[PDB]
């Protein structure tokens, strides 16, 4: 806005979503009942390391005893461990090639978060 | 939201006495009424086929059913606060004293982006730039 | 000088106790006496300790003529010691990375200063 | 400080009228007077050979010369403020309006030490620790 000369009025989360509409038209000045617990363990289907870290940080500030992501399922890589953060502590989360093993190794899991594409989402959910 | 009749199951539930807790509801897609032709919105099931499937119709029905419906989305915060304040007043809710949460360190990436920190480059090149 | 390198201690103590003569080590320790009286961390390090002790070994173990001892140092028998020795650590790391199923490394761009011409 | 006669050149300069600006002075080493034997302090030239070279003697001479000398080091802040306040009052000094200075980022090293940031390790070893 500064560099071009074009008048740009920029607002954040502190401004109401539909506040700019008012400004622009010159009207205003410029089954199961409980699904999750503090114990819930989940399997993430897909290589979504950013999402998993997102969860783990929420879990930490929630003062959860353990991380909510138990393991990840990604069919293109072999089985391995992924580095993560539990506060300032680095921790490892297992990644499995086959869902069968993830389920077997992690019986505590009752939730699956599926990040499969619209294509591979039917078959994977069916498999789960 | 506009499209579908799922919102009406709530009216049914209130009338049947299954739903007793205060419900605040607003259905988006009120603009659709003003368009001369059928407009397919962002979501897949955001298409009104019947007259009952419109946001306007749904909002009217819910308001009549006893649901707390605001004038527009702009008044949603207001009506939620209104309901909440009445529930505190009636002792339905007792707000708990706020406890500060565990502290997580800032991600380096972010810190560097907001220019709060400075870290020197260990390397130096001058032949090729792939970035 | 008051907080020693343990590797130096281990070796220094073996060498003192078993070598018949350690003239070059003695000389080096005298140099250490001087340097540590400038700055206390100017100690005889493990490379200096192995270097001079090895010379003392070749010269005074009685299996080599001076000429032979001097030739071996020159043709880099000491480089052989380090290379052979460290090869164990290096193989150790290779195996470690493989076992740790560690992925491909790419150095981060924020650690590189690109100073190309215009 | 105790030892030397350098401080007396100031008394001379004031008497001669060369030095006109207010001078506040305190000579450290007053304790030395109370010792039964000669005590060599931290500094090289912190040794009183003559009676004139003592902190006590110097402080007396300076005070007599017109120098603002405190009772002890503890009163140094007090006498400095006293002099300053009189200079503001007499319009000798006109304090300039304070401007905020340019901002420098925190060094990464420091930030990490006070645990304000977190940066993930790219490497992982388990065979040897030299740290």
UniProtKB/Swiss-Prot annotation, chain A:
PTM comment: Phosphorylated by PKA and GSK3 in a sequential manner; phosphorylation results in activation of its activity. ISGylated.
Identify the domain of life.
Answer: Eukaryota
Q: Where in the cell is it found?
A: Cytoplasm, Cytosol
What cystine pairs are annotated?
Answer: none
Question: What role does it play?
Answer: Catalyzes the cleavage of citrate into oxaloacetate and acetyl-CoA, the latter serving as common substrate in multiple biochemical reactions in protein, carbohydrate and lipid metabolism.
Its subunit composition reads: Homotetramer.
Assigned protein family: In the N-terminal section; belongs to the succinate/malate CoA ligase beta subunit family.
Name the record gives this protein: ATP-citrate synthase
What organism does the record attribute this protein to?
A: Homo sapiens
- Gene label: ACLY
Q: Which residues of the full protein are shown?
A: 395 to 424 of 1101
């Amino acid at each position: 806005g500064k560099t071009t000369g074009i008048p740009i009025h920029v607002f954040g989360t502190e401004t109401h979503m539909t506040a700019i509409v008012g400004m622009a038209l010159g009207h205003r000045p410029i089954k199961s009942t409980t699904l999750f617990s503090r114990h819930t363990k989940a399997i993430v289907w897909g290589m979504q390391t950013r999402a998993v870290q997102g969860m783990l940080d929420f879990d930490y500030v929630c003062s959860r005893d353990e991380p909510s992501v138990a393991a990840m399922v990604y069919p293109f890589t072999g089985d391995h461990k992924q580095k993560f953060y539990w506060g300032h502590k680095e921790i490892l989360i297992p990644v499995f090639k086959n869902m069968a093993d993830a389920m077997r190794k992690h019986p505590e899991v009752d939730v699956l978060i599926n990040f499969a594409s619209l294509r591979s989402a039917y078959d994977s959910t069916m498999e789960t | 939201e506009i499209g579908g009749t799922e919102e009406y199951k709530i009216c049914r539930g209130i009338k049947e006495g299954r739903l007793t807790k205060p419900i605040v509801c607003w259905c988006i897609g009120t603009c659709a009424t003003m368009f001369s032709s059928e407009v397919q919105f962002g979501h897949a099931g955001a298409c009104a086929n019947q007259a009952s499937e419109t946001a306007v119709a749904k909002n009217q029905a819910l308001k009549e059913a006893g649901v707390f419906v605001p004038r527009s989305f702009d008044e949603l915060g207001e009506i939620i606060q209104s309901v909440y304040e009445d529930l505190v007043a009636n002792g339905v809710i007792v707000p708990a004293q706020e406890v500060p949460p565990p502290t997580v360190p800032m991600d380096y990436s972010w810190a560097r982006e907001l220019g709060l920190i400075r870290k020197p480059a260990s390397f130096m090149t001058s032949i090729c730039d792939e970035r | 000088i008051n907080n020693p390198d343990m590797r130096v201690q281990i070796l220094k103590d073996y060498v003192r106790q078993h070598f018949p003569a350690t003239p070059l080590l003695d000389y080096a320790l005298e140099v250490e006496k001087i340097t540590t009286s400038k700055k206390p961390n100017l100690i005889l390090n493990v490379d200096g300790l192995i270097g001079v002790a090895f010379v003392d070994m070749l010269r005074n173990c009685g299996s080599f003529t001076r000429e032979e001892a001097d030739e071996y140092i020159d043709i880099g028998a000491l480089n052989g010691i380090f290379v052979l020795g460290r090869s164990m650590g290096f193989i150790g790391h290779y195996l470690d990375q493989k076992r740790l199923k560690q992925g491909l490394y790419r150095h981060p761009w924020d650690d590189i200063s690109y100073v190309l011409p215009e």
